[PDB]
Amino acid sequence: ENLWVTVYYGVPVWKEAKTTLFCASDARAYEKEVHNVWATHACVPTDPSPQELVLGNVTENFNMWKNDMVDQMHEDIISLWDQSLKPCVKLTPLCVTLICSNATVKNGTVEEMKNCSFNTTTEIRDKEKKEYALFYKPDIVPLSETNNTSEYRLINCNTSACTQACPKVTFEPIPIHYCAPAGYAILKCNDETFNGTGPCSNVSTVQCTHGIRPVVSTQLLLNGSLAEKEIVIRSENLTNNAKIIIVHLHTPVEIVCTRPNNNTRKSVRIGPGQTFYATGDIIGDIKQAHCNISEEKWNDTLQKVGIELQKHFPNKTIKYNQSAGGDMEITTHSFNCGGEFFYCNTSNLFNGTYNGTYISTNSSANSTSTITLQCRIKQIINMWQGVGRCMYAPPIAGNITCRSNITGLLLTRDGGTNSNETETFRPAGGDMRDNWRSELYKYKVVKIEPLGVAPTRCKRRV
Amino acid sequence: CNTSACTQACPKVTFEPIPIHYCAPAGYAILKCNDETFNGTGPCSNVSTVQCT
Amino acid sequence: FLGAAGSTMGAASMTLTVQARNLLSGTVWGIKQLQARVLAVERYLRDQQLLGIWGCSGKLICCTNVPWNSSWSNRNLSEIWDNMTWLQWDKEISNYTQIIYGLLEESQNQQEKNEQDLLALD
Amino acid sequence: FLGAAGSTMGAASMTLTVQARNLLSGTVWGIKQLQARVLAVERYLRDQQLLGIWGCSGKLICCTNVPWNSSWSNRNLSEIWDNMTWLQWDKEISNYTQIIYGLLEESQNQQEKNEQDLLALD
Amino acid sequence: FLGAAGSTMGAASMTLTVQARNLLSGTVWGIKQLQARVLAVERYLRDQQLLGIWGCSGKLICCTNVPWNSSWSNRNLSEIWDNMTWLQWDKEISNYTQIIYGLLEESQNQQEKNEQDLLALD
Ligand SMILES: *[C@@H]1O[C@H](CO)[C@@H](O[C@@H]2O[C@H](CO)[C@@H](O[C@@H]3O[C@H](CO[C@H]4O[C@H](CO)[C@@H](O)[C@H](O)[C@@H]4O)[C@@H](O)[C@H](O[C@H]4O[C@H](CO)[C@@H](O)[C@H](O)[C@@H]4O[C@H]4O[C@H](CO)[C@@H](O)[C@H](O)[C@@H]4O[C@H]4O[C@H](CO)[C@@H](O)[C@H](O)[C@@H]4O)[C@@H]3O)[C@H](O)[C@H]2NC(C)=O)[C@H](O)[C@H]1NC(C)=O
Ligand SMILES: *[C@@H]1O[C@H](CO)[C@@H](O[C@@H]2O[C@H](CO)[C@@H](O[C@@H]3O[C@H](CO)[C@@H](O)[C@H](O[C@H]4O[C@H](CO)[C@@H](O)[C@H](O)[C@@H]4O)[C@@H]3O)[C@H](O)[C@H]2NC(C)=O)[C@H](O)[C@H]1NC(C)=O
């Protein structure tokens, strides 16, 4: 019997391709005012359902490191954030000669912050007035061409100009659901041991992704999701030491940070109408800003990450080392907390090692042991490199706490030599692409092609 | 100088009330109540439709 | 949405309407979301163009008046229809879809011209 | 545009095409007017989706192969048709339109599959 | 795209599908390009509106149940169809296209109403 071509519509057929993507928000921003924050006003309302629609017989490729969605969200966040700072004051009347503090107390036997005073363009243009405020040390630079220490400057005025984040906005990581426009499908990889490349044998589809946390953080991925079964490790290729290596945790290590200086808010005003905020007198006796982690949890989790590294390096044992130097933004763990921008020295979390021997760390014999990290504070955030950088984070009154869960470590295998049989890993820097990519490995968007062609025994009438 | 900053309305513009016709995009209908003593709530018994107000 | 994916063609022959229906979502935020809201509308009307000009007004199981040249598959109908699933199928026959579209175009237009031979006869 | 509004169903059975035609207007001023210019185009193609998948390619007076379950109205045909006007009818029958859409979907798809049953016989 | 332009009507009766197909192009730069991207999509659906409501679901060579009033041309069929070309023809017949659209509307709607006279008879 003869055969005629027959066209089928409504077919499932896929092609991975670039596409614009919605933003959809969860319920915990719709109680605020409009634009406090973007998720309440711009992003479309979500829907909890449908859940992941299981697929009976699928077989799909999943390259994660070339996933375009990171770029489609990197540019999204850069465009969104840089538009959020538009209406606020563009500082500019602060690039002024700061003539300031008296002698430091007891030559650094103190958790110091420096006081400074300066001349401002008051509400009348040509009748300027003197004013006093205080700043944390990283945001002041010596000015004088000589050794003279009397006169100081903001760390800007050499880089681009700045703007003050308005008090209206909030930095809390409101989750964002990504949803593809109609005509595209979000396919979710579900292979529990998926490393990052190759196929996913069990795959599903969803209308919109489950909410991701957009939190900025360099060395530790705060407030993240959890691996369902076990610790897993990812890289584009482990042979390249320069590549970032992500680690994802099953058991969440609990981290708590605080800045117990009872910092107080002050409201200077600049030119017509628009205010500028700065730290006033500290009430109380000053104390260091710090972060706390339970020691037994960290030891057990680091040893378990040791065995997971040994799964790819059974030939060699594992050591951990201090960061790879550089400036402040790259050396230290830096994460946002309630309004401030914490920066924390990470040496005390990366000084252990593992040599095959899993020690009897748990169950707890005495839970009182806790490690401590010394933490500095900043206000002038050179936020992304070459972006229109310096945001001024306003100083927030009252003492703050950011009790949170660690869920992923960004590391780098050392660029050493001498054929060490106990190879060592450092904390990595954080490209925020890499921060966001770690929480987004599960998803891929595919083009739907609902036109079909196949043979069938038909012959239409004439 | 105590409130926000200002701007000068340019001499080019004019403040005369040029009338505005509100018109709905295609797919919607502007319905006009025509009861001569419609108080403001309840039904209107005599009603029409217009392309643009 | 995609329950028919992976399964064989005969099993996939139904729930096509569900696969066709899903081309609607959203609300506007600026130019880029409006760019997403012109959406697959251009794609949807492109598919409508292709299927209508092949004589298939409406989306259905439209068979045609072009014989299936066996060089496109060189595989029997029964082994294919009962066992194969569409993904590797679309990957393979991509070598032939374009000339197939041309043949559908010319066949449908020739048939439509021949309508006048009867439609001017009555 | 709306001459049939209010009047009974039989009187409203004509001038339907006028009410179908009016989906065109405007010129662009910025994003919001362009948002108005994507218009009911999405609504128009949504209606096209619904009525094309129900076999009614080209909007018409389309009757289907689904029997009218009397539980939806429990009213005689003549009393509804000669006397009722559609507004309260749509308000009341809104309790049943969704399952009606499902029934139209399955009935049309089953009928369309039966085209292959007949047309593979020739 | 336009090979049929200039030539006579009979020669231009083919390659119509080519000229109908070409309604797709581009990538977005801002509001004005997006205004170009709503494109003839509104024009395309206007033509779909006109031809679908004239019963011509799926663009074709559609002849209708309205007799050709000779006052529109007062020229023989053969002299027009074999020799004339569509440009000056469109320029001349523009005096009559509007009432022709009205006649097509009423004729098709009357025919569609008469479908119920048979479709309620079976
Ligand atoms: C960060 O650094 C900034 C600077 O870089 C610090 O801010 C500055 O700090 C300065 C030092 O404290 C302060 O200077 C003040 O000057 C006042 C004089 O004001 C003059 O100018 C104004 C403006 O035109 C005039 O109106 C005014 O009449 C003056 O001419 C002083 O009054 C301040 O000192 C008072 O407090 C100290 C204690 O700390 C006392 O020793 C001193 O005597 C003053 O107290 C008397 O006066 C108050 C009223 O002001 C009376 O109520 C009180 O009872 C005292 O009375 C004396 O006299 C009576 C008899 O009259 C007598 O019986 C009694 O026993 C007392 O002796 C102060 O010196 C700057 O103003 C300030 N900058 C600004 C912008 O305000 C900032 O603190 C630093 N912050 C941190 C955290 O480090
Ligand atoms: C500013 O700094 C102060 C001082 O450091 C800080 O106050 C302290 O906060 C801790 C946070 O954990 C409090 O810890 C307690 O921990 C016990 C467990 O042993 C909990 O049971 C307590 O909470 C429950 O019980 C309370 C009644 O006992 C309830 O009132 C409460 O709502 C909970 O149900 C409690 O969290 C600690 O008690 C306080 N106070 C002191 C003196 O340490 C404060 O939180 C900091 N400010 C901010 C904004 O964080």
Side-chain angles (χ1 to χ4, degrees), chain A residues 149-167:
Chain A
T149 54
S150 184
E151 195 156 293
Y152 271 137
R153 193 193 80 218
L154 266 69
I155 188 156
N156 315 113
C157 312
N158 179 16
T159 62
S160 59
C162 306
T163 178
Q164 180 197 253
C166 279

PDB file of all heavy atoms in Angstrom, chain A residues 149-167:
ATOM      1  N   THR A 149      48.769  63.903  58.196  1.00  0.00           N
ATOM      2  CA  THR A 149      47.601  63.091  58.516  1.00  0.00           C
ATOM      3  C   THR A 149      46.370  63.914  58.875  1.00  0.00           C
ATOM      4  O   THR A 149      45.337  63.332  59.222  1.00  0.00           O
ATOM      5  CB  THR A 149      47.920  62.151  59.685  1.00  0.00           C
ATOM      6  OG1 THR A 149      48.411  62.914  60.796  1.00  0.00           O
ATOM      7  CG2 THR A 149      48.966  61.123  59.284  1.00  0.00           C
ATOM      8  N   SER A 150      46.446  65.242  58.807  1.00  0.00           N
ATOM      9  CA  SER A 150      45.352  66.061  59.313  1.00  0.00           C
ATOM     10  C   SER A 150      44.123  65.996  58.417  1.00  0.00           C
ATOM     11  O   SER A 150      42.995  66.001  58.924  1.00  0.00           O
ATOM     12  CB  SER A 150      45.813  67.508  59.465  1.00  0.00           C
ATOM     13  OG  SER A 150      44.798  68.304  60.050  1.00  0.00           O
ATOM     14  N   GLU A 151      44.313  65.924  57.099  1.00  0.00           N
ATOM     15  CA  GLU A 151      43.231  66.067  56.132  1.00  0.00           C
ATOM     16  C   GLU A 151      42.964  64.726  55.462  1.00  0.00           C
ATOM     17  O   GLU A 151      43.901  63.970  55.189  1.00  0.00           O
ATOM     18  CB  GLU A 151      43.577  67.133  55.091  1.00  0.00           C
ATOM     19  CG  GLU A 151      42.401  67.604  54.261  1.00  0.00           C
ATOM     20  CD  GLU A 151      42.611  68.995  53.691  1.00  0.00           C
ATOM     21  OE1 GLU A 151      42.656  69.959  54.482  1.00  0.00           O
ATOM     22  OE2 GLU A 151      42.731  69.125  52.456  1.00  0.00           O
ATOM     23  N   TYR A 152      41.688  64.441  55.196  1.00  0.00           N
ATOM     24  CA  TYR A 152      41.243  63.143  54.708  1.00  0.00           C
ATOM     25  C   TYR A 152      40.200  63.337  53.619  1.00  0.00           C
ATOM     26  O   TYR A 152      39.725  64.446  53.372  1.00  0.00           O
ATOM     27  CB  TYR A 152      40.657  62.295  55.849  1.00  0.00           C
ATOM     28  CG  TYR A 152      41.630  61.422  56.620  1.00  0.00           C
ATOM     29  CD1 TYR A 152      41.564  61.340  58.001  1.00  0.00           C
ATOM     30  CD2 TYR A 152      42.569  60.641  55.973  1.00  0.00           C
ATOM     31  CE1 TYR A 152      42.426  60.542  58.710  1.00  0.00           C
ATOM     32  CE2 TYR A 152      43.439  59.843  56.672  1.00  0.00           C
ATOM     33  CZ  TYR A 152      43.364  59.793  58.040  1.00  0.00           C
ATOM     34  OH  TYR A 152      44.230  58.991  58.742  1.00  0.00           O
ATOM     35  N   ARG A 153      39.845  62.231  52.967  1.00  0.00           N
ATOM     36  CA  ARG A 153      38.924  62.228  51.839  1.00  0.00           C
ATOM     37  C   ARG A 153      38.135  60.928  51.843  1.00  0.00           C
ATOM     38  O   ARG A 153      38.607  59.901  52.329  1.00  0.00           O
ATOM     39  CB  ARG A 153      39.680  62.356  50.512  1.00  0.00           C
ATOM     40  CG  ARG A 153      38.831  62.680  49.305  1.00  0.00           C
ATOM     41  CD  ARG A 153      39.618  62.469  48.029  1.00  0.00           C
ATOM     42  NE  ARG A 153      39.670  61.056  47.667  1.00  0.00           N
ATOM     43  CZ  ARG A 153      40.711  60.422  47.137  1.00  0.00           C
ATOM     44  NH1 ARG A 153      41.840  61.048  46.842  1.00  0.00           N
ATOM     45  NH2 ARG A 153      40.611  59.121  46.881  1.00  0.00           N
ATOM     46  N   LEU A 154      36.928  60.975  51.286  1.00  0.00           N
ATOM     47  CA  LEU A 154      36.218  59.740  50.998  1.00  0.00           C
ATOM     48  C   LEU A 154      37.013  58.917  49.994  1.00  0.00           C
ATOM     49  O   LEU A 154      37.778  59.453  49.189  1.00  0.00           O
ATOM     50  CB  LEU A 154      34.827  60.028  50.446  1.00  0.00           C
ATOM     51  CG  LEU A 154      33.704  60.050  51.476  1.00  0.00           C
ATOM     52  CD1 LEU A 154      33.854  61.243  52.384  1.00  0.00           C
ATOM     53  CD2 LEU A 154      32.355  60.060  50.789  1.00  0.00           C
ATOM     54  N   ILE A 155      36.842  57.591  50.054  1.00  0.00           N
ATOM     55  CA  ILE A 155      37.580  56.705  49.158  1.00  0.00           C
ATOM     56  C   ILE A 155      37.171  56.905  47.713  1.00  0.00           C
ATOM     57  O   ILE A 155      37.921  56.540  46.804  1.00  0.00           O
ATOM     58  CB  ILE A 155      37.405  55.227  49.556  1.00  0.00           C
ATOM     59  CG1 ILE A 155      38.342  54.350  48.724  1.00  0.00           C
ATOM     60  CG2 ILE A 155      35.964  54.777  49.377  1.00  0.00           C
ATOM     61  CD1 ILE A 155      38.683  53.041  49.380  1.00  0.00           C
ATOM     62  N   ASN A 156      35.991  57.467  47.472  1.00  0.00           N
ATOM     63  CA  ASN A 156      35.626  57.911  46.137  1.00  0.00           C
ATOM     64  C   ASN A 156      36.284  59.252  45.858  1.00  0.00           C
ATOM     65  O   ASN A 156      37.232  59.629  46.554  1.00  0.00           O
ATOM     66  CB  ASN A 156      34.116  58.005  45.991  1.00  0.00           C
ATOM     67  CG  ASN A 156      33.427  56.819  46.559  1.00  0.00           C
ATOM     68  OD1 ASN A 156      32.721  56.920  47.557  1.00  0.00           O
ATOM     69  ND2 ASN A 156      33.623  55.669  45.932  1.00  0.00           N
ATOM     70  N   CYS A 157      35.826  59.935  44.805  1.00  0.00           N
ATOM     71  CA  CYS A 157      36.378  61.181  44.275  1.00  0.00           C
ATOM     72  C   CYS A 157      37.629  60.901  43.439  1.00  0.00           C
ATOM     73  O   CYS A 157      38.133  61.801  42.764  1.00  0.00           O
ATOM     74  CB  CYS A 157      36.710  62.177  45.393  1.00  0.00           C
ATOM     75  SG  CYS A 157      35.400  62.421  46.632  1.00  0.00           S
ATOM     76  N   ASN A 158      38.127  59.657  43.460  1.00  0.00           N
ATOM     77  CA  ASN A 158      39.116  59.206  42.490  1.00  0.00           C
ATOM     78  C   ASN A 158      38.460  58.282  41.474  1.00  0.00           C
ATOM     79  O   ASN A 158      38.802  58.296  40.287  1.00  0.00           O
ATOM     80  CB  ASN A 158      40.260  58.499  43.219  1.00  0.00           C
ATOM     81  CG  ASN A 158      41.328  57.982  42.281  1.00  0.00           C
ATOM     82  OD1 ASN A 158      41.393  58.373  41.118  1.00  0.00           O
ATOM     83  ND2 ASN A 158      42.179  57.098  42.789  1.00  0.00           N
ATOM     84  N   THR A 159      37.505  57.476  41.931  1.00  0.00           N
ATOM     85  CA  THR A 159      36.665  56.664  41.066  1.00  0.00           C
ATOM     86  C   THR A 159      35.449  57.483  40.631  1.00  0.00           C
ATOM     87  O   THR A 159      35.403  58.707  40.788  1.00  0.00           O
ATOM     88  CB  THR A 159      36.244  55.382  41.787  1.00  0.00           C
ATOM     89  OG1 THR A 159      35.479  55.713  42.951  1.00  0.00           O
ATOM     90  CG2 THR A 159      37.461  54.571  42.209  1.00  0.00           C
ATOM     91  N   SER A 160      34.450  56.806  40.068  1.00  0.00           N
ATOM     92  CA  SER A 160      33.238  57.468  39.607  1.00  0.00           C
ATOM     93  C   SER A 160      32.437  58.052  40.763  1.00  0.00           C
ATOM     94  O   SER A 160      32.751  57.805  41.931  1.00  0.00           O
ATOM     95  CB  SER A 160      32.376  56.483  38.818  1.00  0.00           C
ATOM     96  OG  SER A 160      32.022  55.367  39.617  1.00  0.00           O
ATOM     97  N   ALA A 161      31.404  58.828  40.448  1.00  0.00           N
ATOM     98  CA  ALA A 161      30.547  59.395  41.473  1.00  0.00           C
ATOM     99  C   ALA A 161      29.594  58.329  42.009  1.00  0.00           C
ATOM    100  O   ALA A 161      29.488  57.226  41.469  1.00  0.00           O
ATOM    101  CB  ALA A 161      29.763  60.580  40.919  1.00  0.00           C
ATOM    102  N   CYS A 162      28.881  58.681  43.077  1.00  0.00           N
ATOM    103  CA  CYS A 162      28.128  57.735  43.888  1.00  0.00           C
ATOM    104  C   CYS A 162      26.661  58.122  43.970  1.00  0.00           C
ATOM    105  O   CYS A 162      26.216  59.130  43.418  1.00  0.00           O
ATOM    106  CB  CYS A 162      28.716  57.665  45.294  1.00  0.00           C
ATOM    107  SG  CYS A 162      30.456  57.307  45.344  1.00  0.00           S
ATOM    108  N   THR A 163      25.907  57.286  44.676  1.00  0.00           N
ATOM    109  CA  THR A 163      24.533  57.586  45.032  1.00  0.00           C
ATOM    110  C   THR A 163      24.197  56.821  46.301  1.00  0.00           C
ATOM    111  O   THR A 163      24.794  55.784  46.596  1.00  0.00           O
ATOM    112  CB  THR A 163      23.560  57.242  43.900  1.00  0.00           C
ATOM    113  OG1 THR A 163      22.222  57.507  44.332  1.00  0.00           O
ATOM    114  CG2 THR A 163      23.671  55.786  43.483  1.00  0.00           C
ATOM    115  N   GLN A 164      23.246  57.351  47.057  1.00  0.00           N
ATOM    116  CA  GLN A 164      22.847  56.777  48.335  1.00  0.00           C
ATOM    117  C   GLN A 164      21.622  55.908  48.111  1.00  0.00           C
ATOM    118  O   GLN A 164      20.623  56.375  47.562  1.00  0.00           O
ATOM    119  CB  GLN A 164      22.537  57.884  49.345  1.00  0.00           C
ATOM    120  CG  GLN A 164      22.103  57.417  50.730  1.00  0.00           C
ATOM    121  CD  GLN A 164      21.439  58.519  51.520  1.00  0.00           C
ATOM    122  OE1 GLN A 164      22.016  59.068  52.454  1.00  0.00           O
ATOM    123  NE2 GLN A 164      20.211  58.844  51.150  1.00  0.00           N
ATOM    124  N   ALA A 165      21.698  54.651  48.529  1.00  0.00           N
ATOM    125  CA  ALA A 165      20.511  53.809  48.507  1.00  0.00           C
ATOM    126  C   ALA A 165      19.458  54.418  49.413  1.00  0.00           C
ATOM    127  O   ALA A 165      19.734  54.723  50.577  1.00  0.00           O
ATOM    128  CB  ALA A 165      20.848  52.394  48.960  1.00  0.00           C
ATOM    129  N   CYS A 166      18.260  54.608  48.882  1.00  0.00           N
ATOM    130  CA  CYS A 166      17.236  55.307  49.636  1.00  0.00           C
ATOM    131  C   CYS A 166      16.809  54.463  50.837  1.00  0.00           C
ATOM    132  O   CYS A 166      16.910  53.233  50.793  1.00  0.00           O
ATOM    133  CB  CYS A 166      16.029  55.607  48.748  1.00  0.00           C
ATOM    134  SG  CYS A 166      16.219  57.070  47.705  1.00  0.00           S
ATOM    135  N   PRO A 167      16.344  55.076  51.928  1.00  0.00           N
ATOM    136  CA  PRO A 167      15.794  54.270  53.028  1.00  0.00           C
ATOM    137  C   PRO A 167      14.534  53.519  52.651  1.00  0.00           C
ATOM    138  O   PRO A 167      14.166  52.574  53.360  1.00  0.00           O
ATOM    139  CB  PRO A 167      15.511  55.306  54.120  1.00  0.00           C
ATOM    140  CG  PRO A 167      15.333  56.576  53.387  1.00  0.00           C
ATOM    141  CD  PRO A 167      16.275  56.515  52.232  1.00  0.00           C
TER     142      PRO A 167
END
